[PDB]
Amino acid sequence: SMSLQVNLLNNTFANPFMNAAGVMCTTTEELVAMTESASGSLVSKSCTPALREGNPTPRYQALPLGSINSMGLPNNGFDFYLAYAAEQHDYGKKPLFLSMSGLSMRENVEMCKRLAAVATEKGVILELNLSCPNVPGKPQVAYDFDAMRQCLTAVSEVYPHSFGVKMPPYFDFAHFDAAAEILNEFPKVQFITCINSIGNGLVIDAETESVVIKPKQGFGGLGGRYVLPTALANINAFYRRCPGKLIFGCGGVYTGEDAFLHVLAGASMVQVGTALQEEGPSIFERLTSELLGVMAKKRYQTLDEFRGKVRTL
Amino acid sequence: SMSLQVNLLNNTFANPFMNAAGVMCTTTEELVAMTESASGSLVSKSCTPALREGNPTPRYQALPLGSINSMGLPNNGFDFYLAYAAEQHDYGKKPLFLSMSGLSMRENVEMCKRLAAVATEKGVILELNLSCPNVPGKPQVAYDFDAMRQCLTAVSEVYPHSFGVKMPPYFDFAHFDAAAEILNEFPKVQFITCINSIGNGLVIDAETESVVIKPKQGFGGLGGRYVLPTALANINAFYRRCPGKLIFGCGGVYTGEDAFLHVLAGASMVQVGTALQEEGPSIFERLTSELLGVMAKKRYQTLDEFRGKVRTL
Ligand SMILES: Cc1cc2nc3c(=O)[nH]c(=O)nc-3n(C[C@H](O)[C@H](O)[C@H](O)COP(=O)(O)O)c2cc1C
Ligand SMILES: Cc1cc2nc3c(=O)[nH]c(=O)nc-3n(C[C@H](O)[C@H](O)[C@H](O)COP(=O)(O)O)c2cc1C
Numbered sequence: 001s002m003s004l005q006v007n008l009l010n011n012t013f014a015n016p017f018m019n020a021a022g023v024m025c026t027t028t029e030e031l032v033a034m035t036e037s038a039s040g041s042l043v044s045k046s047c048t049p050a051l052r053e054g055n056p057t058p059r060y061q062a063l064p065l066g067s068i069n070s071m072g073l074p075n076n077g078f079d080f081y082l083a084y085a086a087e088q089h090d091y092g093k094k095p096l097f098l099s100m101s102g103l104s105m106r107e108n109v110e111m112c113k114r115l116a117a118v119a120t121e122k123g124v125i126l127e128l129n130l131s132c133p134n135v136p137g138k139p140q141v142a143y144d145f146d147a148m149r150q151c152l153t154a155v156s157e158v159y160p161h162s163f164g165v166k167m168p169p170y171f172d173f174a175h176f177d178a179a180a181e182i183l184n185e186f187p188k189v190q191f192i193t194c195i196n197s198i199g200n201g202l203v204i205d206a207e208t209e210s211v212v213i214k215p216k217q218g219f220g221g222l223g224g225r226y227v228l229p230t231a232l233a234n235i236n237a238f239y240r241r242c243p244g245k246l247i248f249g250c251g252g253v254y255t256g257e258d259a260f261l262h263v264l265a266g267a268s269m270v271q272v273g274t275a276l277q278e279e280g281p282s283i284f285e286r287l288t289s290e291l292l293g294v295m296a297k298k299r300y301q302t303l304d305e306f307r308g309k310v311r312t313l
Numbered sequence: 314s315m316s317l318q319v320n321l322l323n324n325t326f327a328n329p330f331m332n333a334a335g336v337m338c339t340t341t342e343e344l345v346a347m348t349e350s351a352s353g354s355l356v357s358k359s360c361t362p363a364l365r366e367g368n369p370t371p372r373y374q375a376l377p378l379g380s381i382n383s384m385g386l387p388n389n390g391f392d393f394y395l396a397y398a399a400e401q402h403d404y405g406k407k408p409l410f411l412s413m414s415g416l417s418m419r420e421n422v423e424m425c426k427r428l429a430a431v432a433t434e435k436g437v438i439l440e441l442n443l444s445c446p447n448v449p450g451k452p453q454v455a456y457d458f459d460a461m462r463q464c465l466t467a468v469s470e471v472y473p474h475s476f477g478v479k480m481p482p483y484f485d486f487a488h489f490d491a492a493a494e495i496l497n498e499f500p501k502v503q504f505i506t507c508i509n510s511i512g513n514g515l516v517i518d519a520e521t522e523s524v525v526i527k528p529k530q531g532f533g534g535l536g537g538r539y540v541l542p543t544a545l546a547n548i549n550a551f552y553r554r555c556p557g558k559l560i561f562g563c564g565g566v567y568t569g570e571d572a573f574l575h576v577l578a579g580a581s582m583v584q585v586g587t588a589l590q591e592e593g594p595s596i597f598e599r600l601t602s603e604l605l606g607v608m609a610k611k612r613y614q615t616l617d618e619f620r621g622k623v624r625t626l
């Protein structure tokens with residue numbers, strides 16, 4: 001009598017779970033493993049026009065309360081992910097998202113021109129990353145509203161399909177309002193993924209009296225338990241301000257209960273990063289089971305019964 | 314063989330610990346209790362020109378990983394805190410900071426003009442709050458760099474003493490650079506307190522399917538375990554970029570080990586919020602004991618030996 005089914009953008013998803021871009025989605029082996037998993041969908045590693053080796057190691061550290069990273073967009077390059085979407089992915093198993101993270105507006109425009117035909121033919125869906133906080137000297141496009149509007153205009157001009165945007169967290173209603181106003185100008189922006197990491201935290205190991213990652217003097221994006229209330233805030237803020245769009249939640253999901261909170265805040269899909277990095281794709285079997293358990297105890301049969309229904313006081 | 318003594322701003326402090334502004338420092342009884350505690354200093358509740366009731370309750374909630382609040386600047390008004398500084402505080406016991414949070418430039422200018430004489434005569438030190446994330450309709454001043462420059466210019470023009478600024482967290486090196494550039498233009502800003510809460514998080518209780526505080530649809534500032542890596546990042550970022558100024562740490566301190574991390578990142582004083590709210594002023598006896606224990610095990614005698622000495626890779 002229950003279902004985790006999600007229906008959006010002319011697709012049916014068996015459940016709302018997928019990986020967060022960047023986690024377990026860089027290589028062919030990883031993409032196949034995600035496709036064979038119990039997840040409802042998957043997204044490929046944020047790509048640049050050419051391959052990148054990324055930042056020096058160590059560049060990721062798991063922590064009691066989450067994780068810190070400065071990966072620096074290590075990826076196989078756009079051609080590789082385009083080929084996976086065009087020729088290898090089994091769409092009969094689940095829908096596929098492709099994450100794009102060009103290092104300039106022109107880079108994104110040029111990749112989008114080429115992605116267009118594959119989206120048309122095969123149905124891959126674009127998630128445009130406006131938020132990488134780890135490439136040295138590169139600005140957070142989404143923290144620059146003028147730049148964001150220009151980039152979405154440029155992409156919209158050449159990309160004849162719906163797409164979504166991956167956003168960094170905001171921390172002020174003025175910013176939520178400004179960002180929402182811009183996103184609402186673009187009807188092709190049909191979903192907003194909240195959130196990328198909390199940027200530029202600094203973890204210090206008391207025992208070693210040192211930072212724990214090599215790039216950028218130890219500063220890196222935070223994920224995991226640290227970020228859940230910030231993620232819920234951003235999911236709900238955009239759920240409220242962009243009623244014409246769907247929200248994908250990302251941040252702090254370890255359990256079915258955490259997923260329940262994402263959906264209550266407004267999420268349609270729920271992405272899993274840090275927890276997936278630590279547990280592997282088997283996590284999706286556990287999460288679907290747990291979310292159904294939470295729903296059964298609460299007497300909910302479907303996600304639409306409580307999506308966005310968080311009660312205020 | 315050891316000492317927690319700190320010497321700064323023409324004052325001597327027995328140890329680096331003090332309350333965070335807003336926590337246990339609103340009433341006469343609270344200010345006396347802080348003065349009688351083992352803390353090295355104390356700061357009075359951020360004040361407005363007149364008494365203020367603050368936001369509707371519930372407006373604070375303790376959490377497993379910290380706290381969320383939207384107090385809304387409940388305070389007894391500037392006259393009350395000025396009178397405490399001028400007539401009641403025992404400067405023989407410890408130095409006193411007064412936190413100011415006018416709701417406009419004019420309000421801060423007018424309060425500073427009156428504060429000047431008491432600072433001259435009694436030695437109270439101003440901590441100017443540029444970061445409160447809980448007043449409905451009024452965004453963080455320090456998230457508007459032009460507003461920040463104009464507030465600091467006004468205060469510097471009318472206030473004939475050194476002072477400090479309480480800052481919200483930043484999450485991007487471009488913002489650390491921009492904020493530091495502005496702060497460095499004001500020689501009277503002799504200390505920077507990093508950080509105020511991580512603004513506008515949203516805590517949802519899975520059991521009640523609701524938010525946990527009443528104001529602003531449940532959106533409120535995060536404190537406690539959630540914010541420690543963000544606090545360390547901000548402390549260190551400004552320690553590096555504002556070499557002519559002192560950094561005061563605030564965020565996620567529950568133990569002597571946490572305090573040790575603040576100091577390693579660059580902190581001179583260490584402020585305690587959520588943990589003090591939950592434990593009461595007796596916490597300062599525990600924190601001084603724990604910090605000395607950490608230093609003993611590490612064979613450090615003084616704070617100067619490791620302040621700002623966090624090792625990078
Ligand atoms: C190792 C690692 C690599 C990541 N790579 C990407 C990326 O390529 N693109 C992206 O949009 N986000 C990336 N992220 C951010 C995640 O997608 C996610 O937004 C963040 O980790 C928060 O989710 P979590 O709390 O589930 O980890 C990465 C995160 C981690 C830990
Ligand atoms: C109940 C409460 C009241 C606060 N009031 C103030 C305030 O009046 N002025 C201010 O600058 N910060 C205020 N803060 C923020 C704290 O000073 C501190 O920056 C923040 O809680 C992070 O420290 P923590 O992790 O030790 O809680 C308040 C925090 C709490 C929880």
Ligand SMILES: *C(=S)Nc1ccc([N+](=O)[O-])cc1
Nearest residue numbers: 102103104105138139141151
């Ligand atoms: C808008 S998408 N333009 C853009 C993309 C990426 C960068 N970057 O180098 O971070 C800048 C501008």
Ligand SMILES: *C(=S)Nc1ccc([N+](=O)[O-])cc1
Nearest residue numbers: 415416417418421451454464
């Ligand atoms: C700076 S001196 N004054 C000030 C205080 C508060 C605001 N505000 O936005 O509420 C603006 C300027």
